[PDB]
Coordinates of C-alpha atoms and ligand atoms in Angstrom, one line a residue:
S11 CA 100.0 69.4 7.5
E12 CA 99.8 72.3 10.0
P13 CA 103.1 72.7 12.2
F14 CA 102.6 72.1 16.1
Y15 CA 105.7 73.0 18.4
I16 CA 105.4 71.4 21.7
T17 CA 108.2 71.9 24.5
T18 CA 108.6 70.7 28.3
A19 CA 110.3 72.5 31.1
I20 CA 114.3 71.6 31.0
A21 CA 115.1 70.4 34.6
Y22 CA 118.1 71.0 36.8
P23 CA 120.1 67.7 36.7
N24 CA 121.2 68.5 40.2
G25 CA 120.1 64.9 41.3
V26 CA 118.2 61.6 40.1
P27 CA 115.0 62.1 38.0
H28 CA 111.7 61.4 39.8
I29 CA 108.0 61.0 39.3
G30 CA 107.3 64.6 38.9
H31 CA 109.4 64.9 35.9
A32 CA 108.0 61.6 34.4
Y33 CA 104.7 63.2 34.9
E34 CA 105.3 66.0 32.7
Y35 CA 107.1 64.0 30.1
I36 CA 104.5 61.4 29.5
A37 CA 101.8 64.2 29.7
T38 CA 103.5 66.2 27.0
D39 CA 104.4 63.2 24.9
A40 CA 100.8 61.9 24.8
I41 CA 99.7 65.4 23.3
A42 CA 102.7 65.4 20.8
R43 CA 101.7 61.6 19.7
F44 CA 98.1 62.8 19.4
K45 CA 98.9 65.7 17.0
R46 CA 101.1 63.3 15.0
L47 CA 98.5 60.9 14.3
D48 CA 95.8 63.8 13.9
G49 CA 98.0 64.9 10.8
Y50 CA 100.0 67.8 12.2
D51 CA 103.8 68.5 11.5
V52 CA 105.1 68.0 15.2
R53 CA 108.5 69.3 16.7
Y54 CA 108.8 68.3 20.3
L55 CA 111.6 69.6 22.6
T56 CA 112.8 68.6 26.0
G57 CA 115.9 68.5 27.9
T58 CA 118.2 69.8 30.7
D59 CA 119.0 73.1 32.2
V60 CA 122.7 72.5 33.2
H61 CA 124.1 76.1 34.5
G62 CA 123.5 78.3 37.7
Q63 CA 124.5 78.1 41.7
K64 CA 122.5 75.2 42.3
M65 CA 124.5 73.3 39.6
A66 CA 127.7 74.7 40.8
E67 CA 127.2 74.0 44.4
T68 CA 125.9 70.2 44.0
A69 CA 129.0 69.7 42.0
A70 CA 131.3 71.3 44.5
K71 CA 129.7 69.2 47.4
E72 CA 130.5 65.9 45.2
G73 CA 134.1 67.2 44.3
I74 CA 133.7 67.2 40.4
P75 CA 133.7 70.0 38.0
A76 CA 130.3 71.5 37.0
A77 CA 130.6 70.7 33.5
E78 CA 131.1 66.8 34.7
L79 CA 128.2 66.7 36.8
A80 CA 126.1 68.5 34.1
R81 CA 127.0 66.0 31.4
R82 CA 126.6 62.6 33.6
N83 CA 123.2 63.6 35.2
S84 CA 121.7 65.0 32.0
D85 CA 122.6 61.4 30.5
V86 CA 120.4 59.8 33.2
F87 CA 117.6 62.3 32.4
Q88 CA 117.8 61.3 28.7
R89 CA 118.0 57.6 29.5
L90 CA 114.9 57.9 31.6
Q91 CA 112.9 59.3 28.8
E92 CA 114.1 56.8 26.6
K93 CA 112.9 54.4 28.9
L94 CA 109.8 56.1 29.1
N95 CA 109.4 55.9 25.2
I96 CA 109.1 59.7 24.8
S97 CA 109.0 60.6 21.2
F98 CA 111.2 64.0 21.5
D99 CA 112.9 65.5 18.2
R100 CA 115.6 66.7 20.3
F101 CA 116.9 66.3 24.0
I102 CA 118.6 69.7 24.3
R103 CA 121.2 71.0 27.0
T104 CA 121.9 74.4 27.9
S105 CA 125.7 73.4 27.5
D106 CA 125.1 73.0 23.5
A107 CA 127.3 75.1 21.1
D108 CA 124.1 76.3 19.3
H109 CA 122.4 77.4 22.6
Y110 CA 125.3 79.5 23.5
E111 CA 124.8 81.3 20.3
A112 CA 121.3 81.7 20.7
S113 CA 121.5 83.0 24.2
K114 CA 124.1 85.6 23.1
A115 CA 121.9 86.5 20.1
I116 CA 118.6 87.3 22.3
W117 CA 120.7 89.2 24.6
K118 CA 122.0 91.3 21.9
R119 CA 118.4 91.9 20.5
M120 CA 117.1 93.2 23.9
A121 CA 120.4 95.6 24.3
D122 CA 119.9 96.8 21.0
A123 CA 116.3 97.6 21.9
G124 CA 117.6 99.5 24.9
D125 CA 116.1 97.3 27.7
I126 CA 119.4 96.5 29.2
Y127 CA 121.3 98.8 31.7
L128 CA 124.1 98.4 34.4
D129 CA 123.1 99.2 37.7
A130 CA 123.7 98.1 41.6
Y131 CA 121.7 95.2 42.9
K132 CA 120.8 94.6 46.5
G133 CA 118.6 91.9 47.6
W134 CA 118.1 88.2 48.8
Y135 CA 118.6 85.4 46.5
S136 CA 117.1 81.7 46.8
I137 CA 119.8 79.5 45.1
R138 CA 117.1 76.4 45.5
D139 CA 114.5 78.2 43.5
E140 CA 117.2 80.4 41.3
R141 CA 114.8 83.2 42.3
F142 CA 115.3 87.0 43.6
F143 CA 113.3 88.1 46.5
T144 CA 112.8 91.5 47.9
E145 CA 113.3 92.1 51.9
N146 CA 109.5 92.2 52.4
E147 CA 109.3 88.7 50.6
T148 CA 111.5 87.2 53.4
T149 CA 111.0 86.2 57.0
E150 CA 113.6 86.6 59.8
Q151 CA 113.3 83.2 61.5
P152 CA 113.6 82.7 65.3
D153 CA 117.0 81.1 65.1
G154 CA 118.4 84.2 62.9
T155 CA 118.3 82.6 59.5
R156 CA 116.5 84.3 56.6
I157 CA 114.3 82.4 54.4
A158 CA 112.0 83.0 51.3
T159 CA 108.4 83.4 52.6
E160 CA 106.7 81.7 49.4
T161 CA 108.9 78.6 49.2
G162 CA 110.5 78.4 52.6
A163 CA 114.0 78.2 51.0
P164 CA 117.1 79.8 52.5
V165 CA 118.4 83.3 51.0
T166 CA 121.6 84.6 50.7
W167 CA 122.3 88.4 50.9
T168 CA 123.6 89.5 47.6
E169 CA 125.4 92.9 46.5
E170 CA 126.5 93.1 42.9
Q171 CA 126.8 95.5 40.1
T172 CA 124.4 93.5 37.4
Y173 CA 122.6 94.1 34.4
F174 CA 118.9 94.8 34.4
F175 CA 116.0 93.9 32.0
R176 CA 113.5 96.6 31.9
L177 CA 110.5 94.5 33.1
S178 CA 108.8 97.5 34.7
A179 CA 108.5 99.0 30.9
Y180 CA 106.3 95.9 30.1
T181 CA 103.7 95.6 33.0
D182 CA 100.7 97.1 30.9
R183 CA 101.5 95.4 27.7
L184 CA 101.7 92.1 29.5
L185 CA 98.4 93.1 31.1
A186 CA 96.9 93.7 27.6
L187 CA 98.3 90.2 26.4
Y188 CA 96.1 88.3 29.2
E189 CA 93.2 90.3 28.6
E190 CA 93.1 90.0 24.8
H191 CA 94.7 86.3 24.8
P192 CA 93.2 84.6 27.9
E193 CA 94.5 81.1 26.3
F194 CA 98.1 82.3 26.7
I195 CA 98.0 80.8 30.3
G196 CA 96.1 77.6 31.4
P197 CA 94.1 76.5 33.5
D198 CA 92.2 79.6 34.3
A199 CA 92.8 79.9 37.9
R200 CA 96.5 80.0 36.9
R201 CA 95.7 83.0 34.6
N202 CA 93.8 84.8 37.6
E203 CA 97.0 84.5 39.8
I204 CA 99.2 86.0 37.2
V205 CA 96.8 88.6 36.4
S206 CA 96.7 89.6 40.1
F207 CA 100.5 89.5 40.4
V208 CA 101.1 91.7 37.3
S209 CA 98.5 94.3 38.5
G210 CA 100.8 95.1 41.8
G211 CA 103.3 96.5 39.3
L212 CA 106.7 94.9 38.1
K213 CA 110.3 96.1 39.3
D214 CA 113.3 95.6 37.0
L215 CA 114.9 92.2 36.9
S216 CA 118.6 91.3 37.5
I217 CA 120.0 89.2 34.5
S218 CA 123.7 88.7 35.2
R219 CA 125.8 87.8 37.9
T220 CA 129.5 88.5 38.8
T221 CA 130.4 85.8 41.8
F222 CA 130.6 82.6 39.7
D223 CA 131.3 81.5 36.2
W224 CA 129.1 78.5 35.8
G225 CA 126.9 79.9 33.1
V226 CA 126.7 81.6 29.6
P227 CA 129.0 84.7 29.3
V228 CA 127.6 88.2 28.6
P229 CA 128.8 89.2 25.2
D230 CA 131.5 91.7 25.4
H231 CA 131.4 91.5 29.2
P232 CA 133.2 88.3 30.4
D233 CA 133.2 89.2 34.0
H234 CA 129.2 88.7 33.8
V235 CA 127.4 85.4 33.3
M236 CA 123.9 85.2 32.2
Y237 CA 121.2 84.7 34.8
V238 CA 120.4 81.0 34.6
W239 CA 116.7 81.5 33.7
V240 CA 117.3 83.9 30.6
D241 CA 119.9 81.3 29.4
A242 CA 117.1 78.6 30.3
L243 CA 114.4 80.2 28.4
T244 CA 116.2 80.7 25.3
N245 CA 116.3 76.9 24.7
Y246 CA 112.8 76.9 23.4
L247 CA 114.2 79.2 20.6
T248 CA 117.3 77.2 20.1
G249 CA 115.2 74.0 19.4
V250 CA 114.1 75.5 16.3
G251 CA 117.2 77.1 14.8
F252 CA 117.5 80.5 16.5
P253 CA 119.5 82.7 15.8
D254 CA 118.9 81.5 12.2
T255 CA 115.4 83.2 11.8
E256 CA 115.7 82.8 8.1
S257 CA 115.8 78.9 8.4
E258 CA 113.0 76.6 7.5
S259 CA 112.7 75.2 11.2
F260 CA 112.1 78.5 12.6
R261 CA 109.8 79.5 9.8
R262 CA 107.5 76.9 10.5
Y263 CA 107.6 76.1 14.1
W264 CA 108.1 79.3 15.9
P265 CA 106.2 80.6 17.8
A266 CA 105.3 77.4 20.0
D267 CA 101.8 76.2 20.3
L268 CA 102.3 74.9 23.8
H269 CA 105.0 75.4 26.5
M270 CA 104.2 72.4 29.2
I271 CA 105.4 73.4 32.8
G272 CA 104.7 72.9 36.2
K273 CA 102.9 75.7 38.3
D274 CA 105.9 76.5 40.3
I275 CA 107.4 77.9 37.5
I276 CA 104.8 79.9 35.7
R277 CA 106.0 83.3 36.5
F278 CA 109.2 82.7 34.4
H279 CA 107.3 81.7 31.3
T280 CA 104.1 83.9 31.6
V281 CA 105.8 87.2 32.8
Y282 CA 109.5 87.3 32.1
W283 CA 109.6 85.1 29.0
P284 CA 106.9 87.1 27.0
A285 CA 108.6 90.3 28.1
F286 CA 112.1 89.2 26.9
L287 CA 110.4 88.3 23.4
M288 CA 108.5 91.5 22.9
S289 CA 112.0 93.3 23.7
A290 CA 113.6 90.9 21.0
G291 CA 111.1 91.5 18.6
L292 CA 109.8 87.8 18.2
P293 CA 106.2 86.2 18.2
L294 CA 105.0 85.1 21.4
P295 CA 104.0 81.5 22.3
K296 CA 100.2 80.7 21.8
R297 CA 99.9 78.8 25.2
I298 CA 101.3 78.0 28.6
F299 CA 99.8 75.1 30.7
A300 CA 100.8 74.6 34.1
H301 CA 100.3 71.1 35.5
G302 CA 99.8 70.3 39.3
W303 CA 102.2 68.7 41.6
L304 CA 102.2 65.1 42.0
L305 CA 103.4 63.6 45.4
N306 CA 103.7 60.2 47.0
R307 CA 101.6 59.2 50.0
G308 CA 103.0 57.3 53.0
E309 CA 106.6 55.9 53.0
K310 CA 109.3 56.5 50.1
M311 CA 110.4 52.9 50.5
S312 CA 107.8 50.0 50.0
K313 CA 108.6 46.7 51.5
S314 CA 107.3 45.1 48.5
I315 CA 108.1 47.3 45.4
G316 CA 110.8 49.6 46.9
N317 CA 111.3 53.3 45.9
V318 CA 107.9 54.6 44.8
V319 CA 109.0 58.1 43.8
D320 CA 111.4 56.4 41.4
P321 CA 109.8 56.2 37.8
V322 CA 112.4 53.6 36.7
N323 CA 111.2 51.3 39.5
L324 CA 107.5 51.8 38.9
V325 CA 107.8 50.9 35.1
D326 CA 109.8 47.9 35.9
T327 CA 107.4 46.9 38.5
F328 CA 104.2 47.6 36.7
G329 CA 105.0 48.0 33.0
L330 CA 105.5 51.3 31.2
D331 CA 102.0 51.8 29.4
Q332 CA 100.7 51.0 32.9
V333 CA 102.5 53.9 34.5
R334 CA 101.8 56.2 31.6
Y335 CA 98.1 55.5 32.0
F336 CA 97.9 55.9 35.8
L337 CA 99.6 59.2 35.8
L338 CA 97.3 60.5 33.0
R339 CA 94.0 58.9 34.5
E340 CA 94.4 59.4 38.3
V341 CA 94.8 63.0 38.7
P342 CA 92.6 65.8 36.7
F343 CA 95.3 67.4 34.6
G344 CA 96.4 71.1 35.9
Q345 CA 95.4 70.0 39.6
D346 CA 97.5 68.9 42.5
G347 CA 97.5 65.2 43.1
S348 CA 98.9 62.2 45.2
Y349 CA 99.3 58.6 44.7
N350 CA 100.3 55.3 46.6
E351 CA 101.2 51.6 45.6
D352 CA 97.7 50.6 46.1
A353 CA 96.1 53.2 43.9
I354 CA 98.4 52.1 41.0
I355 CA 97.5 48.4 41.5
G356 CA 94.0 49.1 41.5
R357 CA 94.1 51.2 38.3
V358 CA 96.2 48.4 36.6
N359 CA 94.0 45.6 37.6
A360 CA 90.4 47.1 37.1
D361 CA 90.9 49.6 34.2
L362 CA 93.8 47.8 32.1
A363 CA 93.6 44.3 32.9
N364 CA 89.7 43.8 33.3
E365 CA 88.1 46.5 31.5
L366 CA 90.2 46.8 28.3
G367 CA 92.3 43.7 28.6
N368 CA 89.6 41.1 29.3
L369 CA 86.9 42.5 26.9
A370 CA 89.6 42.3 24.1
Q371 CA 90.9 38.8 25.1
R372 CA 87.4 37.3 25.3
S373 CA 86.2 38.8 21.9
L374 CA 89.5 37.8 20.1
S375 CA 89.6 34.1 21.6
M376 CA 86.0 33.6 20.3
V377 CA 87.0 34.5 16.8
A378 CA 90.4 32.3 16.7
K379 CA 88.3 29.5 18.3
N380 CA 84.9 29.7 17.1
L381 CA 85.0 31.8 14.1
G382 CA 88.2 30.4 12.2
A383 CA 90.8 33.0 13.2
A384 CA 89.2 35.7 10.8
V385 CA 87.0 39.0 11.3
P386 CA 83.2 37.7 11.2
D387 CA 81.0 38.8 8.4
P388 CA 78.2 41.0 10.4
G389 CA 74.4 40.6 9.7
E390 CA 71.7 43.1 10.2
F391 CA 72.6 45.7 13.2
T392 CA 70.2 46.2 16.1
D393 CA 69.2 49.1 18.3
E394 CA 71.7 48.1 20.9
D395 CA 74.5 47.2 18.2
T396 CA 73.8 51.1 16.9
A397 CA 73.8 52.9 20.2
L398 CA 77.1 51.2 21.0
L399 CA 78.7 52.0 17.8
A400 CA 77.4 55.7 17.7
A401 CA 79.0 56.2 21.2
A402 CA 82.3 54.6 19.7
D403 CA 82.2 56.9 16.6
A404 CA 81.6 60.0 18.8
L405 CA 85.1 59.6 20.6
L406 CA 87.4 61.0 18.1
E407 CA 85.7 64.6 18.2
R408 CA 85.2 64.6 22.0
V409 CA 88.9 63.2 22.6
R410 CA 90.3 65.9 20.2
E411 CA 88.5 68.5 22.4
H412 CA 89.9 67.3 25.6
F413 CA 93.6 67.1 24.1
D414 CA 93.5 70.5 23.1
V415 CA 92.7 71.9 26.6
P416 CA 94.8 69.7 27.6
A417 CA 92.8 67.2 29.6
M418 CA 94.0 63.8 28.8
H419 CA 92.1 62.5 32.1
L420 CA 88.6 63.3 30.6
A421 CA 89.7 61.8 27.3
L422 CA 90.6 58.5 29.1
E423 CA 87.2 58.6 31.0
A424 CA 85.2 59.1 27.9
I425 CA 87.2 56.1 26.2
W426 CA 86.6 53.9 29.2
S427 CA 82.9 55.0 29.6
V428 CA 82.5 53.4 25.8
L429 CA 84.5 50.4 27.0
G430 CA 82.2 50.0 30.0
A431 CA 79.3 50.0 27.6
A432 CA 80.9 47.4 25.5
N433 CA 81.2 45.1 28.4
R434 CA 77.7 45.4 29.4
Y435 CA 76.6 44.8 25.8
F436 CA 79.0 41.6 25.6
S437 CA 77.3 40.3 28.8
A438 CA 73.7 41.2 27.7
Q439 CA 74.1 39.5 24.1
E440 CA 75.4 36.2 25.8
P441 CA 77.8 35.2 22.9
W442 CA 78.9 32.2 24.7
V443 CA 75.2 30.9 24.6
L444 CA 74.6 32.0 20.9
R445 CA 77.9 30.2 19.6
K446 CA 76.2 26.7 20.9
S447 CA 72.7 27.3 19.7
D448 CA 71.5 25.2 16.6
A449 CA 69.2 28.0 15.3
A450 CA 70.4 30.1 12.3
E451 CA 69.3 33.3 13.6
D452 CA 71.3 33.0 16.7
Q453 CA 74.5 32.0 14.7
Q454 CA 74.3 35.2 12.5
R455 CA 73.6 37.3 15.7
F456 CA 76.8 35.7 17.3
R457 CA 78.6 37.1 14.1
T458 CA 77.1 40.6 14.7
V459 CA 77.9 40.8 18.2
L460 CA 81.5 39.8 17.9
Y461 CA 82.1 42.1 14.9
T462 CA 80.3 45.1 16.9
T463 CA 82.7 44.4 20.0
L464 CA 86.0 44.0 17.7
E465 CA 85.2 47.5 16.0
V466 CA 84.8 49.4 19.6
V467 CA 88.0 47.7 20.7
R468 CA 89.7 48.8 17.3
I469 CA 88.6 52.6 17.8
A470 CA 89.6 52.6 21.6
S471 CA 92.9 51.1 20.5
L472 CA 93.5 53.7 17.8
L473 CA 92.5 56.4 20.3
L474 CA 94.6 55.0 23.0
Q475 CA 98.1 55.1 20.9
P476 CA 99.3 58.5 22.4
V477 CA 98.8 57.2 26.0
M478 CA 100.0 53.6 25.6
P479 CA 102.1 53.3 22.4
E480 CA 103.4 49.6 22.7
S481 CA 100.1 47.9 24.1
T482 CA 97.9 49.6 21.5
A483 CA 100.7 48.5 18.8
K484 CA 100.3 44.9 20.1
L485 CA 96.3 45.1 20.3
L486 CA 96.1 46.7 16.6
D487 CA 98.4 43.9 15.3
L488 CA 95.7 41.1 16.9
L489 CA 92.9 43.1 15.1
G490 CA 94.6 42.8 12.0
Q491 CA 95.0 46.5 11.5
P492 CA 97.6 47.4 8.5
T493 CA 100.6 49.1 9.6
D494 CA 100.1 52.4 7.4
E495 CA 96.6 52.4 8.5
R496 CA 97.0 53.6 12.2
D497 CA 96.5 57.5 12.2
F498 CA 93.2 58.7 13.4
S499 CA 92.0 59.0 9.8
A500 CA 91.7 55.2 9.9
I501 CA 89.0 55.3 12.7
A502 CA 86.4 56.3 10.1
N503 CA 86.8 53.2 8.1
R504 CA 85.1 50.0 9.6
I505 CA 86.9 47.0 10.4
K506 CA 87.0 44.6 7.3
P507 CA 85.2 41.5 7.6
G508 CA 87.2 38.6 6.6
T509 CA 90.4 40.0 7.6
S510 CA 93.2 37.4 9.1
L511 CA 93.7 37.7 12.7
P512 CA 96.9 36.3 14.4
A513 CA 96.8 34.2 17.8
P514 CA 95.3 36.3 20.3
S515 CA 97.2 36.5 23.9
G516 CA 96.7 38.9 26.8
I517 CA 98.4 42.2 26.4
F518 CA 97.7 43.6 30.1
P519 CA 98.6 41.0 32.6
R520 CA 97.1 41.5 36.2
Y521 CA 99.5 42.4 39.1
Ligands
ADN601 N1 107.0 66.5 42.4 C1 106.7 67.0 41.3 N2 105.4 67.1 40.7 C2 105.1 67.5 39.6 N3 106.1 68.0 38.7 C3 107.1 68.4 39.1 C4 107.7 67.9 40.4 N4 108.7 68.1 40.4 C5 109.3 68.9 39.3 N5 108.1 68.9 38.5 C6 108.3 69.7 37.1 O1 109.2 69.4 36.4 C7 109.9 70.3 35.6 C8 111.0 70.4 35.4 O2 111.8 70.3 36.6 C9 109.2 71.6 35.9 O3 108.1 72.0 35.0 C10 108.4 71.1 37.2 O4 107.2 71.9 37.5
LIG602 C1 113.1 77.1 30.8 S1 112.4 75.7 31.8 C2 113.5 75.7 33.5 C3 113.0 74.7 34.4 C4 113.9 74.8 35.8 N1 115.3 74.4 35.3 C5 113.5 73.9 36.6 O1 114.0 72.8 37.1 O2 112.5 74.2 37.8
2HP603 O1 91.1 76.6 32.5 P1 91.2 76.2 31.1 O2 92.5 76.8 30.4 O3 91.2 74.4 31.0 O4 89.9 76.5 30.3

């Protein structure tokens, strides 16, 4: 059992969670679930990033303390992930006691390494982005305001005596990392952008603040709070037992195999983060993958369904596994994408209700009515039977490779390509004609076709468990699959003839 440590970015709980958050959580959950079913020892971390000016300002506007806003809104984020059936091992919050100790410890490591110094900082700060910008990185608007050119967010002039991390000292070491380990950043286009950014030279990074107290206090300097990002990035270490490096959780899980993030926070994870760990003397994560941005087309409010960007509303309207499948099928993972109401309906009704649902229902109903509610004993397999089964048998290896990218969309496309072949096979064989035939050869052929169909459905159902946990669980129940035989290793074992099957019913209803 090889360890596999996967994480998501921890969101600022400044407002309600939206479709973008849900997109990242489900995508990561699918990989974490896949690895569990593939025989890995998985730890899966997610949570919230509660400190910073952005959070403090939101709290002040609402008229409640920052700690109150942080706790209340984080509860909403956790409840969403529980509703999305996310199999996280820990929901971390940067307000956690062990995270305070971890943050103080990594700061100490970097200071002891000689990479932290006190100097005067002058520059522009984007509160919305929690990010520093130079004078040349800003644009003086015709109305007199100053914004950050890249993001469009308003910037505030800042003059503070802060602590600095020696990022300028790590430029070439970071460049060597990208060259020697190209897998460190994914997809490829994102790595090229990071290489280009670092090649322009790096300046030292301000890592403390003096003008507010909503954050982790700097050890021995209570007048300073840690830059929200240094604090935030350390959560990946806290979730495995840091600063207890001798603990068994830290020994087996660190370094992380995959950091799942969006492309708006790539530089924090691929430039600052590895530099922090180099300074601290800690091994680096194996891979950072930046997924694309998902956005709603048309109006936010729909006359029929309501809030289209609200993940809770989408789940209640279409069903959890319907939403989970749509997000991972509609957009090529890593790329930017868009969606509307009709795109979801079209995907629910065609792919799930008809392609998978109807194929499973038509086959299982013929078993329960015409074959005594038991898996039929097959006869001799024809060239058409074999060609379909071979295509279904080839999936596990294909899908495994897609999940390692990660590219869940291509894994789903490969499965549905086989499901398409299974539907064409079912239609060409005409089992509804064979069941009524008096001839003995046709009655045996009827048994083989149904066995061949049920085996393909079984393989597909086992493979789709990471994407649609509950719907596949029900579909495997109807196929008479034992509870302990549902890992990917069971795909090699053909469905047993004579196995008793429960009364079948539709699992993927039409919208
Ligand atoms: N609209 C969106 N589409 C895709 N990802 C998003 C969106 N909004 C936030 N995220 C992601 O959620 C994570 C936590 O805020 C970040 O990695 C960020 O990239
Ligand atoms: C350590 S990941 C931090 C992510 C950040 N809080 C965001 O919402 O963009
Ligand atoms: O671009 P990659 O990271 O999917 O190969």
